[PDB]
């Protein structure tokens, strides 16, 4: 029986909202910056980003 699907549908359109919570703030940040977000972004990476934007002149 597929009767539970009617009750699954609100959980779907609440799951289709966390997918949007996750991908919106990803493809919005993937737009402002040409690259995805870096999670383990320690100070080594901010220093290398500084010197990198200073290397491309």
């Amino acid at each position: 029986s597929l009767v539970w699907l009617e009750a699954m549908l609100p959980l779907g359109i609440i799951g289709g909202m966390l997918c949007i919570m996750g991908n919106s703030q990803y493809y919005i940040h993937k737009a402002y910056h040409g690259r995805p977000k870096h999670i383990g972004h320690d100070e080594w990476d901010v220093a290398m980003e500084r010197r990198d934007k200073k290397v491309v002149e």
């Binding site: 009617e6 549908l9 609100p10 959980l11 359109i13 997918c19 996750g22 919106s24 999670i39 383990g40």
Partner: protein, 318 residues
């Protein structure tokens, strides 16, 4: 900014969670839930909303507007700002804090303020003592959630939530520490009120237990807050213990493995578990409840920090 892309979909998530709870908890009771308003009650949340918005106040009372007209705003802003650090997929956290977990702990410690203030501004002795009892409960199952997170933290390297969900590539912490998931769920049930643990939320004592000046906006914002706090505290039982956005890793040909879809599936499982466990179990009375957070989920949480610390120190698994 892109905070809209995490608050608006979360607002829709809460609005549709009121319907998901009514509908699932109804299906449990052998009855279709909201089913006439929308095609399948899908518009029922919008109907509840647009009704609460169009309801004339009982008394205007816009004078007292700085005391308790911003306290529901505070509760809701906290329930919504604890969503920043929650990562939905690799590099989809809004702000990867290297101390993310402790920040969630602090957000809870401020939700305590939210409850206490929004209960004190209600000049009702019964309602204020109810809000104080609810705050003491939410804060007594916070030492147990604290120690449960110390367990899942010992297993992981750092508090970075993206790391805690990246530290489960080998196995979800739900499989070895299943007894802990049961304690985090039974605490997240009790930290939030929506649970077998909701005597302050006994159907009547809840409405007369948060404020005196409703105006509808207060009623909706508390319930929108409780349902976001619930989506959050279910989005934690799925980062820490279940694999945050990790598949089972069988790498199917049918499945292209989207991340946020897996995080969504798991948080749906835990939301459905919230509902199912609200339907099938009696309330705990707040006098056995507080005697379950201290005498049951604190000893069984302390033991777990010593067990998952020991078994990981002896054999160098750290």
């Amino acid at each position: 900014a892109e905070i809209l892309g995490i608050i608006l979909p979360l607002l829709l998530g809460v609005a549709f969670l009121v319907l998901a709870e009514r509908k699932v908890m109804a299906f449990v009771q052998r009855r279709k839930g909201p089913d006439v308003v929308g095609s399948f009650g899908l518009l029922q949340p919008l109907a509840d909303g647009l009704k609460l918005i169009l309801k004339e106040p009982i008394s205007p009372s816009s004078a007292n507007f700085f005391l308790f007209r911003m306290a529901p705003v505070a509760t809701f802003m906290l329930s919504l700002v604890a969503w920043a650090v929650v990562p939905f997929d690799y590099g989809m956290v809004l702000s990867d804090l290297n101390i993310g977990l402790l920040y969630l702990f602090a957000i809870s410690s401020l939700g305590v303020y939210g409850i206490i203030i929004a209960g004190w501004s209600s000049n009702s002795k019964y309602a204020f003592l109810g809000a104080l009892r609810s705050a003491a409960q939410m804060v007594s199952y916070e030492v147990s959630i604290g120690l449960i997170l110390i367990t899942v933290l010992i297993c992981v390297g750092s508090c970075n939530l993206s790391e805690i969900v990246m530290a489960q590539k080998q196995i979800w912490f739900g499989i070895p520490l299943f007894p802990v998931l049961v304690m985090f769920f039974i605490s997240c049930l009790a930290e939030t009120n929506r649970a077998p643990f909701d005597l302050p939320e006994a159907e009547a004592e809840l409405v007369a237990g948060y404020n005196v000046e409703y105006s509808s906006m207060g009623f909706a914002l508390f319930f929108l807050g409780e349902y976001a706090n619930m989506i959050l505290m279910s989005g934690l039982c799925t980062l820490f213990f279940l694999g945050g956005w990790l598949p089972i890793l069988d790498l199917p040909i049918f499945k292209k493995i989207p991340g946020s879809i897996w995080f969504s599936i798991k948080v749906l499982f835990f939301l459905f578990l919230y509902i199912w466990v609200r339907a099938a179990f009696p309330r705990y009375r707040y006098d056995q409840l507080m005697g379950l957070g201290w005498k049951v989920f604190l000893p069984l949480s302390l033991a777990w920090v010593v067990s998952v610390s020991g078994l990981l120190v002896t054999f160098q698994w750290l």
